[PDB]
Ligand binder design. Structure first.
Ligand SMILES: Nc1ccn([C@H]2C[C@H](O)[C@@H](COP(=O)(O)OP(=O)(O)OP(=O)(O)O)O2)c(=O)n1
Ligand SMILES: Nc1ccn([C@H]2C[C@H](O)[C@@H](COP(=O)(O)OP(=O)(O)OP(=O)(O)O)O2)c(=O)n1
Ligand SMILES: [Mg+2]
Ligand SMILES: [Mg+2]
Length: 986
DNA sequence: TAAGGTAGGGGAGGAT
DNA sequence: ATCCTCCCCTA
């Protein structure tokens, strides 16, 4: 049996480049290296430990020594300042290396052309702990501190040395030592160069592993805390960082397993032996990344707890950590990351617990997939595989494989091992198909962060790191930035974007085109030079700047019932005067513009090929991928705006965020006024998008054609066709004119309007609630899909009943109808559909009523809290009875669960609370609990339909009512309710 | 220990 | 029944 470790595997797979790499090693020649995992020694002399793959694929550890550990604080230039700081630090028993003095540009507040530079002193340390304690003491005492990354220092090293931690790096004049399977390199920052050009094929190793565990009690998830519960199988596979074919495969199991040519089978007699074999195989492979699906919630905690039970955590960790010898208490304290919070989206966070062995980066494929699909209803492996078009995994059922382990059948154990290997292969397929690792590497290169940051952290700190990286470069004059928020913070919301009260109702005659600002907030930042180093706060300083001829953008808004005013120095289209925020946003916008033009060409090449072509599907997928990429960039740039409005951010500037919002409102209103003055009608507005209709005169002559024909259905379809064409061309001309007007107004070309589609039949039901038929290049009314924004059918956790009713409403409203023919209003269509739904009740089955809700214990969502309080009481009652209550078990905090509303019999007590009516789908199907359909109707679809019908005059309030929309919505709700009781036989 | 922003619709439950 | 707060999710 040839148990090939990393070295022989690399030599076999890539022999020529392996020989070249070996020759370079003997000749001590510079060589390329891809880092993945970053580790730091915070105590004692600071050393940066990178782990990764050489050019051929050899595992390599790079130890960067003599890195300057430092942080700077701004104080006046005088010789006694150094001695005073010496005394201050020595009084706090803080050991430091040396003192330096320099000049840097503060990031906050505009300064004159000869006063950008302010004095700074740089404090050096041998250890990260001393630097951390000194930063804390100095900031508590009150000095302004910059370059003070405290939570971690590798980000500061990466941004300071211009050295991305996720890109190829060239090693020069290194100190080489081969030990075991690890080629250790001792280098210095001066001897270690970034390799940015034409990066070769990456040869990092990613192993996907899955575990199968056993519990004697049936129907329960095996608890690692339970002694009798055992992990009995581990299947693992190594792949290239870019390829889905397995370099090698290994299965470790309890029961005997028949030999399979697809993987190496390792047999163990005890759980301690199985864990030891897992550690041994991990050490022999020495992967650059260790990944699994839901491993940060199930696999890693199970393995760690079992190893603690067997008392072998120190041994297996030391074996997995290359040569990093750490004691058990240190392993539990630091390396076993427990209950780490990972932000998936807004108000959405998940838990992750894993053993971060040095030399390997842990990846949870579920975390990455949820980050890519933050609005995914189902977060299972099968759902994620289906979403991206990957092949369906042959599911291993529950009782089958627990029975198979019980029977000690060799071939059944082999089949379970095959399915576990398939699970690992699906993990790698998800990693590669979405290009997760290269995308995270690109993000790390852009933001000068490690891959670990790109995996387990959100983008706000990435925005801060990218800003500081762009700030510390001499071309910009060495802007000095802090990384931790300072100053008193307020609770509230500054004024945001402006939403135009929509002209509610269906439009079937005047085509409506959405014109959107391209990167509205970033474009405003570029145009008005919104940047903290270009910000003036005091009115007298602004007046003095006017006296010197400088153009300032003045903004004012009401925050916390007080007036916040500010002035921003305009760049005058001069690259020298361009701000830091505008510069970073120019770079990001150039990147996104390249991505957008590539996406546009790929969309125009995909539109000319019919979908049945074999090469279309994946190509279509590629299109989405590109879209996702630019979407990410968009979000990233928007984060900059948000990072100026977050009071917890180091770059927090309430005047800047308020100014961005006020400038967006002003520009939207300016374009609104200009478009209205040019005779075009406007239906709706949202932040930056304006929905504009051509004047009827522009459609006169073509209408005359339809007026001069016999007016068949195809005649009106054609008439709509050239109406949409005329729309497109008229909006193109109007967009050019509006862009020229904006250029004349603000003096820059950053603020540009853009046409994206035409919604000729379009219904606006309320603020952020509209839909229509989208025409991008040519009219196509035969598209079943509809451009939808804000309608309840797309809401997360919505019933299939609500989605079906809303889809019926919108598809009936979007139907093309000649003006001579009958044109039913939304009232009649909605009433007809609702009457069909209520009267023909049999059309709704059980699957149409499942809702989905997220269990957040810290959130007092009263309905679900009561529902699961009842479930906890029922579980207590069943355990008292001695029966199993796993079917009623509490879902783990954070995940979403499915439930239905049932008819709770009236026992004239029985509150009509939704909390007492929620039930899990499992027992509702099991016990055939009736579904309270009328509850569903009156509480979800009735309110949905009220939004559609709220535009009628009868529901309109008298002019004295301030909130016309809410009053109309409530009146429509009441009217539709009364209609329901009138039509429903009770 | 990390975690961009505000505007807004609408369900659930309780005060009242 | 009105109104209010909390919550979820979307814009
Ligand atoms: N997650 C988001 C999404 C949007 N916006 C704000 C910023 C945008 O500038 C403004 C405009 O909405 P868009 O969705 O159109 O975003 P952009 O205009 O910036 O880019 P693009 O026009 O390419 O969509 O909405 C935001 O702050 N945060
Ligand atoms: N997260 C978001 C999403 C959207 N918008 C605003 C900006 C733009 C507009 C897009 O609305 P349309 O899709 O109606 O909404 C925003 O400010 N924040
Ligand atoms: Mg499995
Ligand atoms: Mg826009």
């Amino acid at each position: 049996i040839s148990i090939m470790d990393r070295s022989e595997i690399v030599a076999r797979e890539n022999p020529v480049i392996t020989q070249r790499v070996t020759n370079l090693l003997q000749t001590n020649a510079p060589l390329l290296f891809m880092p993945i995992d970053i580790h730091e020694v915070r105590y004692g002399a600071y050393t940066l430990f990178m782990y990764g793959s050489l050019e051929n694929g050899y595992k390599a550890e790079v130890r960067i020594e003599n890195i300057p550990v430092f942080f700077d604080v701004q104080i006046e230039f005088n010789d006694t300042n150094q001695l005073f700081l010496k005394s201050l630090l020595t009084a706090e028993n803080i050991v430091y290396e040396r003192l330096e003095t320099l000049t840097q540009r503060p990031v906050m507040g505009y300064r004159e052309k000869e006063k950008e530079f302010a004095p700074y002193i740089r404090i050096f340390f041998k250890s990260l702990y001393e630097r951390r304690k000194a930063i804390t003491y100095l900031n508590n005492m009150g000095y302004n501190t910059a370059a003070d990354d405290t939570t971690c220092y590798y980000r500061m090293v990466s941004r300071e040395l211009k050295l991305p931690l996720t890109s190829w790096i060239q090693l020069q004049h290194y100190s080489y030592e081969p030990r075991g399977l690890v080629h250790r390199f001792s280098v210095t920052p001066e001897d270690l160069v970034s390799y940015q050009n034409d990066g070769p094929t990456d040869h990092s190793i990613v192993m996907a592993y899955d575990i199968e565990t056993y519990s004697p009690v049936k129907g329960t998830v095996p608890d690692p805390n339970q002694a009798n519960d055992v992990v009995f199988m581990i299947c693992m596979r190594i792949f290239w960082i870019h390829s889905t074919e397995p370099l090698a495969s290994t299965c470790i199991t309890m029961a005997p397993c028949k030999k399979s040519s697809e993987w190496t089978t390792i047999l163990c007699s005890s759980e301690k032996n199985l864990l030891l074999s897992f550690a041994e195989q991990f050490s022999r492979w020495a992967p650059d990344i260790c990944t699994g699906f839901n491993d940060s919630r199930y696999d890693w905690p199970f393995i760690v707890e079992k190893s603690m039970q067997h008392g072998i955590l120190e041994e297996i960790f030391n074996k997995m950590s290359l040569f990093w010898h750490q004691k058990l208490d240190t392993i539990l304290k630091c390396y076993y990351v427990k209950e780490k919070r990972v932000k998936i989206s807004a108000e959405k966070s998940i838990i992750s617990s894993f053993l971060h062995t040095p030399g390997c980066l842990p990846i949870d494929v579920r975390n990455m997939c949820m980050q890519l699909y933050p609005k995914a209803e189902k977060t299972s492996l099968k759902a994620f595989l289906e979403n991206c078009g990957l092949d369906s995994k042959v599911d291993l059922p529950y009782h089958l494989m627990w029975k198979y382990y019980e029977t000690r059948d060799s071939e059944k154990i082999a089949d379970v091992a095959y399915y576990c290997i398939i699970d690992a292969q699906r993990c790698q397929d998800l990693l590669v198909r979405h290009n997760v690792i290269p995308d995270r590497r690109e993000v790390g290169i852009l933001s000068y962060t490690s891959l670990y940051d790109c995996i387990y952290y959100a983008g706000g700190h990435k925005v801060c790191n990218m800003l500081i990286a762009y700030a510390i470069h001499d071309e910009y004059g060495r802007i000095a930035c802090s990384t931790i928020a300072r100053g008193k913070r307020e609770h509230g919301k500054y004024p945001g974007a402006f939403v135009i009260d929509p002209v509610k109702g269906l439009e079937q005659d005047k085509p409506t085109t959405g014109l959107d600002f391209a990167s509205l907030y970033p474009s405003l930042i570029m145009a008005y030079n919104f940047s903290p180093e270009k910000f003036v706060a005091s009115r007298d300083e602004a007046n003095s700047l006017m006296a010197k001829g400088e153009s300032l953008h003045y903004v004012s808004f009401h925050f916390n019932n007080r007036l916040v005013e500010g002035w921003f120095v305009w760049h005058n289209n001069v690259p020298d005067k361009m701000g830091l925020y505008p510069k970073v946003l120019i770079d990001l916008l150039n990147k996104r513009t390249a991505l957008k033009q590539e996406l546009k060409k790929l969309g125009e090449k995909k539109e000319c090929i019919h979908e049945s072509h074999p090469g279309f599907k994946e190509l279509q997928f590629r299109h989405a991928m590109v879209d996702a990429k630019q979407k990410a960039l968009k979000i990233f740039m928007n984060t900059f705006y948000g990072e100026a409005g977050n009071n917890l951010s180091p770059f927090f500037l309430l005047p800047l965020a308020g100014g961005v919002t006020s400038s967006g409102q002003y520009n939207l209103k300016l374009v609104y006024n200009f478009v209205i003055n040019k005779g075009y009608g406007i239906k709706y507005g949202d932040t930056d998008s304006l929905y504009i209709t051509c004047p009827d005169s522009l459609y006169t002559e073509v209408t005359d054609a339809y007026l001069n024909s016999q007016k068949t259905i195809k005649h009106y379809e054609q008439l709509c066709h050239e109406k949409v064409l005329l729309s497109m061309k008229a909006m193109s001309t109007l967009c050019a004119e509006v862009n020229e007007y904006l250029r004349q107004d603000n003096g820059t070309s950053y603020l540009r309007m853009a046409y994206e589609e035409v919604l000729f039949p379009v219904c606006f039901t309320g603020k952020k609630k509209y839909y229509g038929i989208a025409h991008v290049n040519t009219p196509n009314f035969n598209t079943k899909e509809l451009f939808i924004r804000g309608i309840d059918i797309i809401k997360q956790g919505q019933t299939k009943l609500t989605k079906t009713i809303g889809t019926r409403i919108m598809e009936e409203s979007m139907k093309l109808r000649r003006p001579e023919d009958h044109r039913p209003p939304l009232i009649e269509i909605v009433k007809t559909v609702l009457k069909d739904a209520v009267v023909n009740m049999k059309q709704w089955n059980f699957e149409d009523f499942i809702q989905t809700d997220a269990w957040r214990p810290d959130k007092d969502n009263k309905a679900v809290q009561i529902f699961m309080s009842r479930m906890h009481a029922r579980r207590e009652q069943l355990k008292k009875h001695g029966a199993a209550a796993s079917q009623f078990a509490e879902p783990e905090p954070g995940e979403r669960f499915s439930y239905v509303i049932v008819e709770k019999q009236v026992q004239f007590t029985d509150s009509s609370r939704k909390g007492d009516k929620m039930e899990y789908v499992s027992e509702a199907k099991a016990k055939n609990l009736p579904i309270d359909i009328l509850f569903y109707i009156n509480n979800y679809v009735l309110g949905l339909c009220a939004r559609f019908i709220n535009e009628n005059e009868e529901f309109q309030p008298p002019d004295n009512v301030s909130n016309k929309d809410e009053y109309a919505q409530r009146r429509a709700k009441s009217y539709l309710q009364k209609f329901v009781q009138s039509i429903h036989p009770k």
